[PDB]
Design a protein around this ligand. Structure first.
Ligand SMILES: Nc1ccc2cccc(O)c2n1
Ligand SMILES: Nc1ccc2cccc(O)c2n1
Ligand SMILES: Nc1ccc2cccc(O)c2n1
Ligand SMILES: Nc1ccc2cccc(O)c2n1
Ligand SMILES: N[C@@H](Cc1c[nH]c[nH+]1)C(=O)O
Ligand SMILES: N[C@@H](Cc1c[nH]c[nH+]1)C(=O)O
Lengths: 419, 419
């Protein structure tokens, strides 16, 4: 009998070759988070289904990987991290010191009728307790920093930015009760990649008249902040905020990375203010990352006081395709410093003591574990990219030495000199 | 309405405080693996239930966290990593270069009728393609290395070691067909922590006579390798192997960490040779880690040629309790190098440029994001353990300077000198 060697439908294996690629990326996510002063957290991949019941026609909750425990409890593999984060924050209450800057790199999950990936890793960064656009500034700079760290430039990618408050106004001024607003953002998010007829249809389903639909479409196609200003005023808070945002990003030195786009809304119900989305400037890939401000979610979860929040998620799949296309993911193979080679099996104990010493000195080192010829041991050393082979032979050992060969003739060296 | 702030039954939250503890541990697991030349891998937490159907009464497979997809597919959250590893190895075939030394730190899962933890993280280390006890030597040394790295000594803990081949002989020589052997190990593993009557009963259920049961119990209580040698001969391969194992561990310098214990068998069906288990020398905690040789598993999975393997798993929960008891987990709080403080909001752009510079130089740095008084900014700096506060004020800025205050009076410094 033969076991199924392929992973479960829509899930990825990470043998060493693929793991090095993932590690290269996560190392940047971690390093960027540390540079920016964010704290790591984590929570269970398994959460209560109840945590995601938002009733706004979101794709994320529609495609929920859910099931029922033997105990009858309705659960899901998390489709996103933000609800888990909020649960932790709400759990802490007044004991949480603010501001708080928390990051994680959870695997998140989806399930579709179409048998597409069902899992991905998503770097999450969130700032909690900060009212002003400085939070969004910092988050957008963090995302650019990560991409620049990966070797991309502002010629390769950007982050396009908007605020939902502009549309909020239009919807409210058009006589539509604010309860329809989140559903509208969800529908209008689809504007980009499906027919306008199909989107207009969906909005009409919500009970909004053609004239109201009109204003929405128009405001999505406005190309500048000044044209927004003409539409809603120069001190509509949206304008002041976006200007402050762009000014602050410019002062940090990432002005070439960011721009305004009135069509950016995102697909999540809970964004209340600034929203943003990373993209490739060749128009070839899906969104690289996405985020925004969500000031009401915690109130929504039963927080007795409103807690301002903003953040983003940054997936592991699209960024990697982009990097591959741009030839910014060279395979650096697995490597070690030293390979210790017993001359024969009688030298194994001596070679072990040498191994101990090298590792004690902070070196990465292998020892040849099987019985083999010296030449094969050198073949192995080359396979693992050793800087150095350390041959432990009877002759040198009697002199208190080993034979060392730099791989990146051969020379006898006292034990103490090795390290 | 209030959302449930507690995590799902039997699952842990990792807010920053708990995450630092976990990170401290994983950092050792990673560092130890690199020191020993192991390669990282990963696979999906979700695997086919079929992968674990071993039919040997194992607790691990009995307590399987399984469910059925909407597609009707029988799946589980992995109870262990070793089957996933084997799937990857079998998937590679002849293209896998040997030897291979692979590690991972998967979250693994269980489900019980008793509502105990249902998840844990388990450092896995495995050596593939090595016939000789040198593999086991290296794995046991790796486990000790990790524990010593965490600040434990050979007075605190040990690893007790045995080989199943001794018992294999007894079972086979007693006329019991080898198919009963794995089930027997599974039963005898329970010997330790349940009544002997209850264990003897279970073996009788398998159809083994009282005389055969007798020999098993006796051999479990033999206290030395010499007494095993008297029982099965000095060149029963078990004896030679254990002697070689102990000799090699002694030569690496971890002789005080290891010992022989004829009662150690482990609960897993697939161990064929040497097996081992980490323990605390005060007899206070459950097993810290556990592993062994499993030379038949890949054959069992349909590998057309036998592939030798050995490894262990090292849980994240018991080790941490031990470390807490031993006071080896001091809370090091979250820290940053620098906190940049705008004197007021008019200095925010200048302060951002300063932030850019510090981060460009590899420093971890925050900027005060909200509007606040300088004194509050210093309170925040103290909260995040900054080495340095960098006050960006109009006066100094006009001189091309900032004001720097070492936290671990205050002095003006040119921008360029900061880094
Ligand atoms: N929300 C999710 C959850 C899981 C995903 C897997 C692959 C790609 C995605 O965009 C995913 N999005
Ligand atoms: N030991 C090292 C260190 C760095 C290396 C870079 C590329 C290829 C190698 O084999 C390397 N080996
Ligand atoms: N096999 C497993 C799988 C999950 C576990 C969770 C907590 C403690 C354990 O010993 C576990 N063992
Ligand atoms: N920046 C640092 C660096 C090291 C520290 C150690 C303990 C407490 C601290 O606040 C520390 N802050
Ligand atoms: N949860 C969002 C990203 C995000 C993090 N924080 C705020 N938003 C998503 O999956 O797109
Ligand atoms: N899978 C084993 C540990 C192990 C890893 N490799 C071999 N054995 C366990 O969970 O106990």
């Amino acid at each position: 009998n033969m076991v199924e060697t392929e992973p479960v439908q829509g899930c990825r294996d990470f043998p060493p070759e693929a793991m090095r690629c993932r590690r290269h990326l996560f190392d940047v996510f971690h390093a960027t988070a540390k540079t920016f002063g964010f704290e790591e957290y984590d929570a269970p991949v398994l959460e209560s289904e109840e945590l995601y019941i938002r009733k706004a026609g979101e794709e994320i909750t529609e495609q929920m990987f859910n099931f029922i425990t033997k105990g009858g409890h309705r659960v899901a593999l998390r489709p996103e991290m933000t609800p888990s984060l909020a649960r932790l924050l709400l759990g802490k209450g007044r004991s949480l010191l603010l501001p708080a800057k928390w990051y994680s790199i959870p695997q998140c999950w989806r399930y579709e009728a179409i048998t597409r990936r069902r899992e991905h890793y998503q770097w999450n960064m969130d700032i909690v307790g900060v009212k002003s656009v400085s939070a969004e500034v910092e988050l957008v700079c963090a995302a650019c920093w990560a991409m620049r760290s990966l070797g991309l430039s502002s010629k390769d990618v950007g982050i396009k930015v908007n605020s939902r408050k502009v549309l909020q106004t239009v919807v409210e001024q058009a006589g539509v009760t604010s309860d329809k607003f989140a559903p509208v953002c969800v529908i209008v998010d689809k504007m980009e990649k499906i027919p306008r007829e199909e989107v207009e249809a969906q909005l009409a389903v919500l009970g909004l008249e053609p004239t109201v639909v009109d204003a929405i479409t128009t405001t999505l196609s406005l190309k500048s902040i000044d044209e927004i200003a003409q539409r809603v005023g120069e001190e509509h808070e949206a304008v002041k905020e976006l200007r402050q945002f762009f000014e602050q990003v410019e002062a940090y030195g990432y002005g070439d990375w960011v721009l305004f786009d009135a069509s950016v809304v995102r697909g999540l119900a809970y964004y209340t203010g600034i929203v943003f989305e990373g993209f490739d400037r060749e128009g070839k890939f899906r969104a690289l990352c996405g985020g925004g401000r969500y000031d009401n979610l915690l109130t929504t979860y039963g927080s007795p006081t409103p807690i301002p929040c903003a953040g983003f998620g940054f997936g592991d799949c699209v960024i990697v395709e982009l990097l591959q296309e741009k030839r910014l993911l060279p395979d650096i193979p697995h490597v070690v410093d030293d390979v210790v080679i017993p001359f024969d099996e009688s030298m194994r104990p001596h070679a072990l003591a040498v191994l101990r010493r090298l590792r004690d000195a902070g070196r990465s080192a292998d020892i040849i574990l099987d019985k083999k010829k010296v030449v094969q041991a050198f073949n192995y050393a080359d396979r693992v990219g050793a800087v150095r082979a350390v041959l432990v032979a009877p002759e040198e050992w009697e002199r208190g030495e080993v034979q060392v060969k730099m791989l990146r003739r051969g020379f006898a060296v006292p034990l103490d000199r090795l390290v």
